[PDB]
């Protein structure tokens, strides 16, 4: 049955749908169904809500805005914004150092009243640092189960077009991350990627993968 948390969530998502009219209907339908179910789920929860949004280059600004505003919509009943993390801010960096930074940022927020995070540009984290998402995204042993994490992946393709089905979009994201995380892997890091760890990460963050379309009213770079 529907809660006041969900009614606030729906209030905010309705506004988003009205502001961003260039999206696939299934973006809104499937993300709301997924996140409401988590918000409505009984305690104890077994897993955080983990939503993966992706986009091609021609939709970079929509990806950034809609991911953060959907995460804030999840938290609106709590009158706090989602935690913001950005992988473009981490790429040149020592993997173990980045892992400590991400862990501190997420844990500090989640311990102190915040219940969602947006993880922008997940593909740009140094590969080994992304092992921190086992702590936060594991199927049953995650550190905070009563939260949402919205992750984004910005593809290097110029456009997705509107013809792709979700299975093809998911394969694109999976394949692209495998390339990015192999490229940025540093085996001499304490935390380093390997094939089983990479597939395990993919399994834990790919529950719901949705594409985001361009919004010309965003080229401004200011969210609506």
């Amino acid at each position, epitope marked *: 049955v529907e809660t006041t948390a969900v009614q606030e969530f729906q209030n905010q998502m309705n506004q988003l749908k009205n502001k961003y009219q260039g999206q696939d209907e299934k973006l809104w339908k499937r993300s709301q169904t997924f996140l409401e179910k988590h918000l409505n789920s009984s305690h104890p929860r077994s897993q955080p809500a983990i939503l993966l949004l992706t986009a091609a280059r021609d939709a970079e600004e929509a990806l950034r805005c809609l991911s953060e505003q959907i995460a804030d919509a999840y938290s609106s009943f709590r009158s706090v914004r989602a935690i913001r993390i950005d992988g473009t801010d981490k790429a040149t960096q020592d993997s173990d150092t980045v892992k400590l930074e991400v862990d501190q940022e997420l844990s500090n927020g989640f311990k102190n009243g915040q219940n969602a995070a947006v993880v922008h540009r997940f593909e740009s984290f140094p590969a080994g640092s992304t092992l921190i998402f*086992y702590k936060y995204c594991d*199927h049953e042993n995650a550190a905070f189960k009563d939260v949402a994490l919205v992750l984004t992946v910005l593809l290097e393709e110029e456009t997705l077009g509107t013809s792709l089905g979700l299975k093809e979009v998911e394969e694109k994201v999976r394949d692209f991350l495998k390339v990015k995380f192999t490229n940025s892997n540093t085996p001499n890091s304490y935390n380093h990627m390997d094939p*089983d760890k990479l597939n395990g990460l993919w399994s834990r963050i790919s529950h719901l993968v949705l594409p985001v379309q361009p919004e010309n009213a965003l080229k401004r770079g200011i969210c609506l």
Partner: nanobody
Amino acid sequence: MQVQLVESGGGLVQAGGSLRLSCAASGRTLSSYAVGWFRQAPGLEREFVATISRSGGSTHYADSVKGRFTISRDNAKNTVYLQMNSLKPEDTAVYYCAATFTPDGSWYYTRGSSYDYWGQGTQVTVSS
């Protein structure tokens, strides 16, 4: 190559008896995987039975089988076991072994949705 699971040890027993299910893993080292046993009878929901961490150090059991069943693993022989004692008709079902990678040696999984690999199942029938 992905890991492959093959369960054996099923069969028919009268209530009160015992069975020992085994699952042999091929293609990958079993020590890579947390392992779970699940069971399903016709028309009913698949049920968690037991689970064991990669190290063997951590286990968990369904309330209905605790004290009767014991999950264990022999990573050297790439095999996992489910000792089933004091069997009851309520235990009749097809039993499946499942495996899933995790980087933490103590973590286990009690939900089937957590598991990537499954065996073909072995029938366990407990007569009344």
